[PDB]
Symmetry: C3
Amino acid sequence: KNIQVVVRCRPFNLAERKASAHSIVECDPVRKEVSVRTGGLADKSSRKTYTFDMVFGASTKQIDVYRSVVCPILDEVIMGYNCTIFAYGQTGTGKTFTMEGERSPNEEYTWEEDPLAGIIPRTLHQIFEKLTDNGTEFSVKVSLLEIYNEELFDLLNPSSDVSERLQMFDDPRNKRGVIIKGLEEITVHNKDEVYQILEKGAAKRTTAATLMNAYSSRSHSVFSVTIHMKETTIDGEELVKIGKLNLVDLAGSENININQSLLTLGRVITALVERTPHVPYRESKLTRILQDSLGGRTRTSIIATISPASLNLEETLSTLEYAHRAKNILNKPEVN
Amino acid sequence: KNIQVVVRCRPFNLAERKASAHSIVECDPVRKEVSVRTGGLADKSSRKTYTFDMVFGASTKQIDVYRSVVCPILDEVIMGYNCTIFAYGQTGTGKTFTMEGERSPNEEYTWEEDPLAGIIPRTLHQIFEKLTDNGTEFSVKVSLLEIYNEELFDLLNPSSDVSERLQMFDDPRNKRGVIIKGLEEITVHNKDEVYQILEKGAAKRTTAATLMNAYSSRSHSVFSVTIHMKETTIDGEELVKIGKLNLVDLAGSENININQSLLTLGRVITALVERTPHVPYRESKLTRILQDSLGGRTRTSIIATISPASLNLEETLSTLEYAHRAKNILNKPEVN
Amino acid sequence: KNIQVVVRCRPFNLAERKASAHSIVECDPVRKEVSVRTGGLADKSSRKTYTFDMVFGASTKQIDVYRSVVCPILDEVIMGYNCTIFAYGQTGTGKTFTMEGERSPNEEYTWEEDPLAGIIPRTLHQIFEKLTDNGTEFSVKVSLLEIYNEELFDLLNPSSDVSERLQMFDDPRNKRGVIIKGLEEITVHNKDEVYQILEKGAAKRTTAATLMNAYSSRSHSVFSVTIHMKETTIDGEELVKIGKLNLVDLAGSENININQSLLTLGRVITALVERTPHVPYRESKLTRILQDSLGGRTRTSIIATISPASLNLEETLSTLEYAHRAKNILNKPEVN
Ligand SMILES: Nc1ncnc2c1ncn2[C@@H]1O[C@H](COP(=O)(O)OP(=O)(O)O)[C@@H](O)[C@H]1O
Ligand SMILES: Nc1ncnc2c1ncn2[C@@H]1O[C@H](COP(=O)(O)OP(=O)(O)O)[C@@H](O)[C@H]1O
Ligand SMILES: Nc1ncnc2c1ncn2[C@@H]1O[C@H](COP(=O)(O)OP(=O)(O)O)[C@@H](O)[C@H]1O
Ligand SMILES: CCc1cccc([C@](SCCN)(c2ccccc2)c2cccc(O)c2)c1
Ligand SMILES: CCc1cccc([C@](SCCN)(c2ccccc2)c2cccc(O)c2)c1
Ligand SMILES: CCc1cccc([C@](SCCN)(c2ccccc2)c2cccc(O)c2)c1
Ligand SMILES: [Cl-]
Ligand SMILES: [Cl-]
Ligand SMILES: [Cl-]
Ligand SMILES: [Cl-]
Ligand SMILES: [Cl-]
Ligand SMILES: [Cl-]
Ligand SMILES: [Cl-]
Ligand SMILES: [Cl-]
Ligand SMILES: [Cl-]
Ligand SMILES: [Cl-]
Ligand SMILES: [Cl-]
Ligand SMILES: [Cl-]
Ligand SMILES: [Cl-]
Ligand SMILES: [Cl-]
Ligand SMILES: [Cl-]
Ligand SMILES: [Mg+2]
Ligand SMILES: [Mg+2]
Ligand SMILES: [Mg+2]
């Protein structure tokens, strides 16, 4: 019902250690609380403390995130629901690391086994174990678009030029959802197809980053997975159940047509929590795509990412405030 | 009468080819049409198509531009009219290349013969052939100023510091024109003087680019040529006919006191085409200089430059829209 | 009474000489006038001329600045007054050079003898000569904070992370002054302590410059010196006299929450000279700190710094105009 909101804090990086950054963040997994030290040299006892559905401190690893947050959501996708997980937070804090992950250098690890892999690869792997281990007939289609400056780009298209644009339209079968005209949806026949698909997507992103200013922090990225499963009743009737999972990595929250989406996202959340009558979904590409995940029939989680350094105090607080409000968004989840 | 407007599209560059840029532009010289592919991955048949006075595709060369556009204008300068050609378009699309040209590397070519030379050098050469081949007594004076951030700089001054500023005043002999106080006008005695004059101007520009932020894309450049010719009537009377040619290379059109001129240019064109009563010439240095070329006694052409890449779709459309409106500007041309 | 305002013009630098910068500034020490050549190529005789309390031309040296401006102020600090000197001017013109100075390269000079040393080191040295040469018991405490984006940072704190923030509060003993909660005030026992203190402060600044965007030009720097002296009356009574000296190096004047202080400074000066009723001290960190120096019981001087190059004409004029107004600020100076 309420959307689930969790917080992940990344460890210090080398720049921060070189600069002797002190920590101002404290995670308590059991009480599910984050607590920010607030008063610098002036007031040593000051704190702001917030309660979330779950809390992940600096030493938390990609496997822990997946086990705690995604497994439950993945089961519900398998039972024929739509789900959305998204990452919100300041640039540099681990939205991408959490949602995609990285490759460990050289040969080192098989992609199914890279400890650095994030939610998207781990999920694609699990869909194959859980549904093959299980008998049952199924197909998996993925897609990956990016929104930048209110234009949409298709990272998995066979087209060789990233800058060729998609277009968006209302679904006549779902008052709350959209059709992306031109989107490539690639059918993923087994887990041995996965990596090449992602690698071509990554190569497409690299080109786009060289074409557009500050691409990697000003853009939103939407990875979707659609699964079709065959169910036979006890009467012997053959009916299909469809589950869809969107994995969204938002533009950096510090950025306030170039910020349109990140700004309409904020107004949308506000209009929902403060129960205002017209909710401005239409006003950005992002919120049209996410409309059903903010107040609709989709089950939603948010991963708020934060830095632990004293330097980013203000933005850290800002992310926590923003994400804590979002707990009061109520969805009405429903199978397809 | 109507001002003449033409379009030049440059070929792909190496960055674009490295990025597998697709083309979205199509020039048809005979029907005089440019046609932009408009719907990316979503709608393959979509186009916007526009008709101009002339159209130059990617494979068009500097010699072709000169033959088609300038010769006719040069004849009319020789017959004692004022003319203005200017380049309008997004940064990176060939305003400078078209108006000045480049030098081919090493020894390679004599400047009169460099295939890379643009309109200004080619014109200065022709003035000397056409008027020496012709008997007739004549003098040629040139000048070159730049407007940046509403300050005027004189690239041909003997002064060693580029940053010394010119000032502007109304001409008491021409309700539509200006005197530039302090401008150096250099007398060009033969074509063997030309290149050194341009080379010193280029060296002055190089310094200015290091002094002022983004100088080369935020500045307007005005090259003028003034020719005095001696005519004897059939009665034996000696009267002088003066022709003047301005060659303007505007700041890049993507830039929206720093954009004052490019912004007042837009309002001026608007006030003329939509027949509004007070036309705000006074409000920028550029439009004061160009006042007689926008709605006055000067004969004007505009060269709109565009990229062919899918990436620049929006600006490409924007340039074509802007330039197509300008066809409805009516001038009343007249000898001096 | 009136605040004292003086002008320092720096010599050309290598970039300017490489670019053949002409000069547009003329200092006349005896008549106390600066005079800016104003009309570029257009009008050679044009000038704007301004009178200040003192005037220092390009060839003036750090020792001259100190002798003329600081000695008098230092005597008055010793007699138990509060004084403030601050530097105002465009980035690149010598606020830091004037207020701190530089180190001559390699071994070269003892810090007490470096010809490049500015007002802060020279002053700390003199406090020790003048008060030891003199018998009399005394202690000296220094402090150094920086304001950036309305946050306060403490460069002399033992804390290893610069980004830990101070907080500000009204002094209940002085309607016109503030307490900085958390500020480290280091006791300086002899002149052999000085340099290490400054060197640690400089190392703290270096880190901050790497943490925050454009730190060195957008930040204000406040160095304070507090001196306690023991006086015995002729009756044999033991009373303490306190003198305080603030040495402020403002953010660059070309920058118009990031400009809040530099903007409220301007409004404050305006409200004083134009005698407006509510003076908006409260509205920035800087003006709260400086409140007593703008219209209060502190004795104030301003050092306006300017470039001599033709290129910076506009900002040069702007600094002179701004500083000339400030001569009409009246203070009511008083011992503690
Ligand atoms: N949880 C984490 N553990 C270790 N390193 C991390 C973590 N999160 C982020 N990083 C590192 O910080 C950098 C920024 O992460 P990134 O995902 O790009 O953040 P964002 O996309 O939010 O800007 C990357 O180099 C990443 O390795
Ligand atoms: N018509 C053309 N043919 C070949 N190269 C061109 C052409 N127009 C522009 N270029 C190249 O593109 C770059 C940008 O041209 P430039 O004239 O500087 O554009 P602008 O002044 O409009 O920014 C230059 O390197 C130039 O060689
Ligand atoms: N009076 C001066 N004499 C010689 N060099 C100077 C003088 N003032 C400034 N400079 C040089 O100019 C540069 C800028 O000085 P700086 O104090 O950093 O100016 P600001 O802090 O006003 O930006 C420094 O390299 C400094 O050496
Ligand atoms: C860009 C699509 C995507 C999504 C999720 C994970 C990956 C990557 S890391 C994404 C770049 N931030 C990937 C990296 C390099 C080449 C191919 C694939 C991926 C896949 C599997 C495991 C892993 O650790 C990383 C890529
Ligand atoms: C800057 C004045 C100007 C005008 C038109 C053409 C040129 C140049 S190229 C302008 C730089 N974008 C020129 C280039 C380098 C040195 C001297 C002259 C020029 C002159 C003749 C032929 C030619 O190909 C180029 C220069
Ligand atoms: C940053 C505090 C401070 C104040 C005034 C003067 C100095 C320096 S130069 C300040 C940097 N712009 C200083 C430079 C490097 C290392 C230690 C001290 C200083 C102290 C004494 C003499 C001198 O020439 C310079 C430092
Ligand atoms: Cl690291
Ligand atoms: Cl922690
Ligand atoms: Cl793992
Ligand atoms: Cl629609
Ligand atoms: Cl808002
Ligand atoms: Cl090329
Ligand atoms: Cl073509
Ligand atoms: Cl040729
Ligand atoms: Cl005038
Ligand atoms: Cl407008
Ligand atoms: Cl120098
Ligand atoms: Cl001088
Ligand atoms: Cl000295
Ligand atoms: Cl207070
Ligand atoms: Cl104001
Ligand atoms: Mg990212
Ligand atoms: Mg150019
Ligand atoms: Mg400085």
